Design a protein around this ligand. Structure first.
Ligand code: FES
Ligand code: FES
Ligand code: NA
Ligand code: NA
Lengths: 102, 110, 104, 111
């Protein structure tokens, strides 16, 4: 359902399982919300991929099926990056999107 | 959990018939789906002055001015700021913006 | 009134050093929202969460539960007629922009 | 900005009686509210006076008050009233509207 680039994984050792959900946002409609968690909500959609579990929130499946997550330090600094095939628009930074109206 | 005011109940109750809509068991089932809605975006600015017309409150010893006319939308706004994995962002909480209005199809025939 | 947490004061105090009057205005915009699908149904799905308000059975989709917690459903007739009003304290929460000018 | 058909006027004076929740002034206050259908639902109230900050329009011996933050969403709205089997309903034709829901109460604006 969802992938992470090896690059993201390792920024994820950074622990000084991952849970992707969305929240309403000013730029766009939805901004990704990322947490490191002890346990997936029981109804999350899980994927293995480089021995990590990825917890997609079920209500957001529609908004996230197919998602790609990468870490890049570029000229704006270091941040997770997102290639969401469901995004019909992403803000400038990539962390906010909107999908097409139903 | 969920509350249904009693006005929401009569309407429900009004709805289980209409036509011959089942003299049988009837549970209210709520599920959800991603959608979008009108929203008010906040323009925070640091002026030298208020307009001779803003409403001035006080929080953290900073004065806050609000446009006379956004008054109702704005009392209730709580501005926070969190840094997480996605970085650092202001967080806007407002219970009045929380009000969404439901579909009107139940009321309408053209 | 408008309330600014300590975490937010510090992030503003930060910026301002790069009289303190913060001014707020709104402009019409859009954001993402959860649409509540109400239905009346015979039985719930076997995975739903069952609750109750005033003697109505309410089945909630398993995933919707976190988000629906504290949802209040009112109903009003105005000049436009009747419709449910939904007020969800959870979802009254919008995340601001992650970006800033590099020289501000 | 903002027009009422006599049909809408007629219905407005009707409710400004027989539902003598009036404010007892020929004042109609229009604003919007976030909507499950589309983006914004219109919201109409008869009020006693308008908020000092609203945008006034005078039609047909009626004061029409548009909430200032919604100016942009409502400029040039025309409001009609159509009888139906429910007793009637206001209709809105909003030059700002990019889609309108099935029942007309709600509209989206352009992205
Ligand atoms: S508000 Fe639901 S279709 Fe008109
Ligand atoms: S969140 Fe504002 S540009 Fe991406
Ligand atoms: Na937005
Ligand atoms: Na909506």
């Amino acid at each position: 359902m969802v992938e992470l680039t090896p690059a993201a994984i390792q920024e994820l050792e950074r622990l000084q399982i991952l849970r992707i959900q969305v929240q309403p946002s000013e730029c766009g409609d939805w901004r990704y919300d990322l947490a490191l968690v002890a346990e997936p909500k029981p109804t999350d959609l899980l994927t293995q991929s480089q021995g990590w579990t990825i917890a997609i929130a079920a209500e957001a499946a529609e908004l996230l099926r197919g998602l790609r997550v990468d870490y890049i330090e570029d000229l704006m600094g270091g941040a997770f990056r997102f290639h969401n095939p469901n995004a019909s628009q992403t803000c400038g930074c990539g962390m906010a999107f909107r999908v097409s109206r139903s």
